[PDB]
Design a protein around this ligand. Structure first.
Ligand SMILES: O[C@@H]1[C@H](O)[C@H](O)CO[C@H]1O
Length: 271
């Protein structure tokens, strides 16, 4: 069996666990050996992961960048080693990439903003918990959210990165809460930060604040169902992973593939 490598940004996020399971199930299906490497959100670790794979007989590299701008050196090393690179979920700003597979994060952010305006009303006072700064996913969701801010005249009280992490999202929201107790709604750029934000609101006794997450992970869907999370934009991580391995197969078989493959989003609300 030919080996396909999957370098994922982190395995400490349910979203990336499902992405890995999607790839594993498709690799099993198509008869490939799948090696999984965790970069642990560290560009230095990511680079070393890629350097080690280029000599393991890896035929194709599926990579989820820890940083869209810094991953360029790793992609270029794969390029020198003649190993095709497919990015999943986040882009690579530099280096040659065969195909990129992800959601429309600009649309995702806009839909989140529109839903908030529908519930909390136009001109609502909002806070935004942004993802890791140098990732295409976070940059795009902020951009889509900025279109909603302008359309619905939201008053953005504060906007700060909590790095797609639940504990950080918790602490950042705790601090912004003390400084802006008049917040009406919060857009968290992933479900982990949205879950952390809910816990901060719980600790602070603020039951009145509407929170919108992003991903539709098991925990995020449970919160929406329990009525704790107002909504989440569901992604299809398992299908981003499957589409990556499927696309890896086509490349290895000499079939040309599209440069971009979108994966649908869906607004998830209770009922
Ligand atoms: O799309 C993914 C998911 O939202 C994850 O939760 C954080 O990283 C983003 O790039």
């Amino acid at each position: 069996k030919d080996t396909i490598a999957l370098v994922v940004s982190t395995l400490n996020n349910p979203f990336f666990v499902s992405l890995k399971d999607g790839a594993q199930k498709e690799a099993d299906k198509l008869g490939y050996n799948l090696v999984v490497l965790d970069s642990q959100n560290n560009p230095a670790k990511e680079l070393a992961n890629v350097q080690d794979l280029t000599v393991r007989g890896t035929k194709i590299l599926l990579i989820n960048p820890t940083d869209s701008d810094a991953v360029g050196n790793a992609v270029k090393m794969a390029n020198q080693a003649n190993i095709p690179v497919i990015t999943l979920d986040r882009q690579a700003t530099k280096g040659e990439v065969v195909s990129h597979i992800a959601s429309d994060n600009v649309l995702g952010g806009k839909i989140a903003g529109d839903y908030i305006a529908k519930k909390a009303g136009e001109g609502a006072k909002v806070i935004e918990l942004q993802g890791t700064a140098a990732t295409s996913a976070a940059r795009e969701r902020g951009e889509g959210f900025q279109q909603a801010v302008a359309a619905h005249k939201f008053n953005v009280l504060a906007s700060q990165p909590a790095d797609f992490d639940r504990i950080k999202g918790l602490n950042v929201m705790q601090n912004l809460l003390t400084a802006h107790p008049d917040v009406q709604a919060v857009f968290a750029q992933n479900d982990e930060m949205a879950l952390g934000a809910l816990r901060a609101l719980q600790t602070a006794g603020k039951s009145d604040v509407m929170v919108v997450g992003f991903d539709g992970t098991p925990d995020g869907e449970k919160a929406v169902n329990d009525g704790k999370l107002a909504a989440t934009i569901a992604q299809l991580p398992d299908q981003i992973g499957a589409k990556g391995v499927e696309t890896a197969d086509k490349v290895l078989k000499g079939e040309k593939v599209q440069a971009k493959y979108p994966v649908d989003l869906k607004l998830v609300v209770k009922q």
